[PDB]
Amino acid sequence: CVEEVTTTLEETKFLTENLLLYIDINGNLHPDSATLVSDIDITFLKKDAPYIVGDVVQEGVLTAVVIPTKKTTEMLAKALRKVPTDNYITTYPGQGCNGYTVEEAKTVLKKCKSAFYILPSLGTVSWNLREMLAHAEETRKLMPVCVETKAIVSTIQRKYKGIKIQEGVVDYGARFYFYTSKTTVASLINTLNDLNETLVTMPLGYVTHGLNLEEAARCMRSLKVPATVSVSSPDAVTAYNGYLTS
């Protein structure tokens, strides 16, 4: 019913051409699905938004289902039951920001309406901004920075006289990825995954995108690069790690 394959997307197409993607209420692709869509028009995903959980859109080789965020496992199962019975290449549903575990996803796919081929898929610290900047500078790790956070921008401008801060990668003094809250956490995670650099970072989405620390920890599971994650205090180190022990 569910088979974990050892192959890349292209190397799995011999089994089936059909891909099952996960989207949110607005038709935005989950980070795990966002990389499976190259050279395909995806206008249809957002064209009919907003959706409700369980809605399914299809075009060509692609099927996409709107999935929930865990509070429930029953709601994730109910959403997957709407996918037409077929054979699909996919990823485990509900990972990353949505908050489900791999075992929860397996439980849901165990119900076996369709057949699924599942593609294959650093210490936490409490460092202040001065410490993070110094660490980035010497290690050459990429440091995401929200440019709306003026206190950070001001610090960077004082440390690296002459830096011209703008959105995107800026490599001046240290290597920064400057972003704003006006793009999604998913898009930021996908960009950082594509850059394929080790990070030194605060939890992504925390505060800037309205996420609490647990929600941000869930999203951080979608990173496919190593990351030194720096949290607000020693007590937050324990909390954050606990969110990941789950």
Residue numbers in the entry: 417 to 487, 491 to 540, 550 to 674
Q: Can I see the authors' text?
A:
Among all SARS-CoV-2 encoded proteins, the nonstructural protein 3 (nsp3) is the largest, and it participates in many essential steps in the virus life cycle. In addition to the CoV-conserved domains of nsp3, SARS-CoV-2 nsp3 harbors a “SARS-Unique Domain” (SUD), which was first identified in the SARS-CoV genome. SUD contains three subdomains; there are two macrodomains, Mac2 and Mac3, that are followed by a frataxin-like Domain Preceding Ubl2 and PL2pro (DPUP). SUD-core does not possess enzymatic activity; rather, it functions as a binding module for viral and host molecules.
Therefore, we engineered a disulfide bond in SARS-CoV-2 SUD-core based on SARS-CoV SUD-core; the resulting mutant containing double mutations L516C-Y647C was denoted SARS-CoV-2 SUD-core-CC. The crystals of SARS-CoV-2 SUD-core-CC belonged to the space group of P321 and the best crystals diffracted the X rays to 1.35 Å resolution. After the screening of SUD-binding compounds (detailed in bellow sections), the SUD crystals co-crystallized with the hit compound 4 diffracted to the highest resolution 1.35 Å, thus was used for in depth analysis. Our highest-resolution dataset (1.35 Å resolution) was obtained by co-crystalizing SARS-CoV-2 SUD-core-CC with Comp.4, suggesting that it interacted with SUD during crystallization. However, the electron density of TF3 could not be located. SUD-core-CC comprises tandem SUD-N and SUD-M macrodomains connected by a flexible loop region. A nine-residue loop region between SUD-N and SUD-M (residues 541-549) is completely missing from the electron density map despite its atomic resolution, suggesting that this interdomain linkage is highly flexible. We clearly observed the engineered disulfide bond between L561C and Y647C, tethering SUD-N and SUD-M together. We superimposed SARS-CoV-2 SUD-core-CC and SARS-CoV SUD-core, and 257 Cα atoms aligned with a Dali Z-score of 24.1, and a root mean square deviation (RMSD) of 2.6 Å. This high structural deviation stemmed from distinct interdomain orientations between SUD-N and SUD-M in the two SUD structures, rather than differences in the individual domains themselves.
